Amino acid sequence: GETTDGVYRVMTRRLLGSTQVGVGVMQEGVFHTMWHVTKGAALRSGEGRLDPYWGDVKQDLVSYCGPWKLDAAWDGLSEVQLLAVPPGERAKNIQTLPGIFKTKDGDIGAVALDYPAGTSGSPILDKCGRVIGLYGNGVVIKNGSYVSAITQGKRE
Amino acid sequence: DMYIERAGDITWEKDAEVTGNSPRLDVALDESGDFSLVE
Numbered sequence: 597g598e599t600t601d602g603v604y605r606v607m608t609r610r611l612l613g614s615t616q617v618g619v620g621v622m623q624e625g626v627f628h629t630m631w632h633v634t635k636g637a638a639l640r641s642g643e644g645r646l647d648p649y650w651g652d653v654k655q656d657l658v659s660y661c662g663p664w665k666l667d668a669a670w671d672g673l674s675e676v677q678l679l680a681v682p683p684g685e686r687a688k689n690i691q692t693l694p695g696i697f698k699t700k701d702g703d704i705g706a707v708a709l710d711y712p713a714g715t716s717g718s719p720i721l722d723k724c725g726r727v728i729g730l731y732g733n734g735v736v737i738k739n740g741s742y743v744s745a746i747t748q749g750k751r752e
Numbered sequence: 753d754m755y756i757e758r759a760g761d762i763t764w765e766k767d768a769e770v771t772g773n774s775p776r777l778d779v780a781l782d783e784s785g786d787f788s789l790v791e
């Protein structure tokens with residue numbers, strides 16, 4: 597099918613019309629997305645088929661055709677770009693300085709940009725163009741606005 | 753059934769829309785992968 601590196605929209609014809617349920621990254625022949633986007637189900641790419649290979653509900657991640665390939669990390673200091681791919685709208689880079697999700701298991705970067713739910717799985721980048729995580733799993737703060745984590749997998 | 757469609761390249765773009773704040777939150781992550789605010 598289409599295994600070119602890049603950002604992709606995850607679509608479904610199961611609801612009314614064609615609906616964008618999420619977004620994923622294709623890197624080294626491995627498609628990467630959030631678990632709540634696909635629920636682990638198989639994906640189509642033209643005539644080709646992508647079957648899940650690794651997944652974890654707590655991490656809210658899943659990889660197709662191979663192990664998780666993305667291992668770059670936010671340095672805790674620099675600005676990053678959210679390559680937001682919203683439903684029915686063009687891919688657009690948005691630069692921000694991440695906040696912090698302080699947990700009992702440690703700190704995680706967090707991007708405070710709000711987008712439709714079908715934007716989940718849009719990659720967050722460093723100044724070199726490396727995917728430091730996926731956008732789309734977070735919280736709704738005192739203000740009522742959305743703060744997503746910078747969710748990164750593990751390269752075995 | 754679900755299917756994918758390419759939406760672009762993964763590249764950093766100079767002079768893009770700079771927006772968003774940087775908050776420090778106390779969060780908790782449950783077994784279902786959902787985040788919640790701890791206060």
Ligand SMILES: COc1ccc2sc(N)nc2c1
Pocket residue numbers: 710711712713714715716731732733736740741742744
């Ligand atoms: C403001 O509420 C929400 C709820 C769910 C999602 S998924 C996403 N990427 N952004 C949001 C925002």
